[PDB]
């Protein structure tokens, strides 16, 4: 019964403003987010719900609601846009993309 | 509220979590032979008949088996003891000579595995050499490349690292070892067998020393362990984690009999000035290859009980056991040490079949190896000399080591594989009951008492 | 236990008992903390790097009892009133509910402060036991 | 000897003397028991595995004297009556004939028994040390 | 330093102070002398051949204080007159001008005699401690 | 080489019967008997103590 | 050396033991120091030796 889900599918936003991404879950366990520009090696952003990876500003963070998770970002400049992926224990979410207006 | 003055008392019992270097104590008269044993120290002489015990009144304390540092200490202990006891023994380096090998003809037939190899060796005087021969009972000798001759084999120690044979003057054994804390520390022991690895325990009892631990090593299966008294226990860091491991203790032992029917003969070779080399010289009997026997009527029921125990945590998921995962030869096979040799078995039928729990003689073909890397699998490489005559082992299996599969399988199905691990993980199944805490006689507590007044002697105050 | 009797593994049951019983038969820890149970390999050096640490800790505790004016005394009062912020100011009617192990948290933070007051509780005696006035 | 004077090897002659002289100048053993006179090979490890044993034994003896109220006292009376079966009940008439080395046999069996009563004689002071209305 | 609490690297300044200030805050040396800061190679054996020497020195000093009657006492009078030849016989007028480090030379030669005198001043208590009709 | 490899004594070190005195550690006394009629076993009644042999 | 000749060093090649002690092979190393003593007792001006 372990299935993930991410929404919304894609974003087109002006730089310097927030965005909101949701990652659902159906099992007790940790969670982490990954960032991916096209081509390059993806990067870790946050893990264990709300703890934050080394070498990133405080733009990116979220809350562990329990049966669901919400990620929000603040003041996203044009150079930080890419593709987001959710994680659990083996399951990688459907993924979503943010693009610059 | 009341008028109070500070008061000292101490000598009190109060403890906190800590780490230490423990003392070892071997059981019974084993200390007499312990001078010349390895996997036993030099020597854990027992000063008292351990373990004395008391049940603590209304005490509950936290426990943890995975963070437990005693296994981490005993890994270093056993590795250091092993290397230091192997250190003064005779080296075997100058055998690495171009071996010419052929089918090992034997009495009234031909043997199944080994090769009769003959090579040049150094006699007593270094300026001359002779044509000795020995029967290495492994096909694992590598054929040297860079040649169309299909017979110039090489011993595989010299490919990566020199080696040292074990002195027969010192014999390894699974002697029981009891750990006793040094002065100032106490070892707390939990007695609630429902303890599933982490959490409170509310029947804590202190002991001067730990109960009988024995350092026997075996991958994919535990040998001569200790059984959970009531039911079959499952323990893991977190079951839902696909990684990590699942340790299982059985409720009843199942006898395992393993033997080596070939009647080997021990031979000596004079490699150097005082250095004597032992090898299997000739076979003087019939040939059947080594094997193990396990009764099906017990094992088939044991798997079903462990299956329903698994299904308790995995609701309505049918359990499939399946063949070993893969990888090295030390974990695709069942490894267990016995009597001087090292046995490797294919797990012919200790894996197969599905058993839902709700109910909707086995033979193992085993290879043998002389040269081993230690089960930590990096450093030292040995030569284990052959043991004369047929060998017989009788031991009690007590616990299984499993890892989980998945997953995009259809959610009603699940699969488990027998796969071993570190040397630490085998002992951790037996050392899950203990902590180490330092007794701290604390400072100041309030009292009805008042000032002393010129150091006055007085009665009740 | 009452009187003394008992053993280390006959008195350690007080660890969960009410503090009244633990205030009696408080002796065997001192008898236990010193020695207890205890070619070169792992057996050897452990008897030295471990035993000497135990002896060192015991001398530390004995010295700390010596300075305060409590040498050779299992039980020792001092001249320091108990400030209300550190704990219940009426523990005489409350320690009958609490064991030592659970008690220790309630004063773990303020333990380091109180030694600074036992030290002056000693050195006031130091000042008093010397000078001129008391001719004999 | 009288006073102390003497040496370790100036007082050890008392070992065969009457108990009267051995009762005086009883100190130099307490001065001797501490340390006395004391590439790696056999000379090296012996100054540790033997030295620490001597220090351990001395701390054990000091602890045992510390519990019973006889801390820092060469001589120490105590509240335990002497039972008949342990020895002569008139040894004030008899110790003038006996050296200690011969005396030790006559009470070798009962020492462990006597410590049991001596501990009680000590720790009955704990009840008196606290917790009622001695007004001063 | 002055006061009571003191630190080793807060009180050691008294080494050049007038002896009066060194007559207070005298504790931290006793608090430091015990332990202080502390494959086999040069690091290993030093923690044993050095730590045990410090422990032995501390036990030696403690025993020497124990015999004379000054066990567990930072300051300790003793029943011996001060002979004129050893120092100024009015040092209460003079020690306010001298530090300990300079003082030590002035009595370096006569320490061994004074230890022998305190030994007698102690064991004159032994005759008092036993064997007559003090009805108590 | 018939039975066991060997090693030579370095001339840097020398064989010498230097006298050695055994000294007791702390807390022990090495008793000594002075009666030269002592034939190996039995009482000795002129016992003397020493720091070292 | 590449497009020239180096100043400090001499190329050297010698026989060495392979994994099996009964055979040997040729190898070469560049000891970056002139200080390899030419063995005496020979008119061959090339049979050097390591000075350890």
Numbering used by the authors:
A (entry chain H): 1 to 30, 33 to 91, 96 to 107
B (entry chain E): 1 to 360, 371 to 471
C (entry chain F), D (entry chain J), E (entry chain B): 472 to 509, 527 to 624
F (entry chain I): 158 to 210
G (entry chain A): 106 to 157
Source paper text:
A glycosylated region near the base of the third variable loop (V3) of HIV-1 Env forms a supersite of vulnerability that is targeted by antibodies originating from diverse germline genes in multiple HIV-1 infected individuals. Here, we determine structures of antibodies in complex with HIV-1 Envelope for all observed members and ancestral states of the broadly neutralizing HIV-1 V3-glycan targeting DH270 antibody clonal B cell lineage. Here we used cryo-EM to visualize the interactions of a complete inferred DH270 clonal tree with the co-evolving virus Env.
To visualize the V1 loop conformation when not bound to an antibody at the V3 glycan bNAb epitope, we determined the structure of the d949 SOSIP Env in complex with the CD4 binding site antibody VRC01. We found that the conformation of the unbound V1 loop resembled that of the UCA-bound V1 loop. The d836 and d949 Env V1 were markedly shorter but still retain the hydrophobic core and V3 GDIR/K motif coupled position of the earlier viruses.
